[PDB]
Amino acid sequence: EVTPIQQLFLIKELKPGIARIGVIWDKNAANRDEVLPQLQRASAATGIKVVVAEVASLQEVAPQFRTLLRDHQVEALWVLEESGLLGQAAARSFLIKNATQAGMPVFAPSETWLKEGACVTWRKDAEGIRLVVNKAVAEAMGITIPAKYQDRTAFL
């Protein structure tokens, strides 16, 4: 319900200064032809370069993540859905741990990721976007809440 471009504009204010972000995309997720060109348009609109790494199985997750880190030097990890592989505990734990140990916040699609170490997720209410924030991690990662959302932010 929060669109990819709305998400990337939020990310721009949550981690200000960010210039490169990494997306891990499940090749078996729905809507690739919609989401993936929207990411490139979001990139041009926001000024943040978006690099997408696609994965089909757990053995692809680790090498693809390292490509994002060494080849592209991304500054955050962004996961847009968790219907399949990214909804598995093994993939979720791997991505959060290796992102965190690289100094990268994780912007995640559900509170399950927050319960495991991700920084921020979001929801759309009648009064607009609301943020859900892992207070412990977000404080350590230097996440900043835009002024409009100060009153629309819940801690896990």
Automatic annotation (TrEMBL):
<keyword id="KW-0732">Signal</keyword>
<protein>
    <submittedName>
        <fullName>ABC-type uncharacterized transport system periplasmic component-like protein</fullName>
    </submittedName>
</protein>
